[PDB]
Amino acid sequence: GVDNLQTQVTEALDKLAAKPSDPALLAAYQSKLSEYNLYRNAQSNTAKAFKDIDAAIIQNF
Numbered sequence: 375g376v377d378n379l380q381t382q383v384t385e386a387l388d389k390l391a392a393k394p395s396d397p398a399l400l401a402a403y404q405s406k407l408s409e410y411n412l413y414r415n416a417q418s419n420t421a422k423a424f425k426d427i428d429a430a431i432i433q434n435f
Contacts, residue, residue: 383406
């Protein structure tokens with residue numbers, strides 16, 4: 375579900391790259407970029423927390 379995003383962001387960027395004067399396309403690209411960033415930060419922050427549990431597991435082997 376993260377690659378569809380990677381796709382929609384590239385797709386939105388392509389449409390804008392070809393018609394940079396359209397504000398609806400600049401709004402769509404901005405919106406999908408932050409959706410992408412939000413999602414990715416959610417993933418990396420969630421992995422870091424699980425790593426905390428992993429650390430606790432390991433040092434209590």
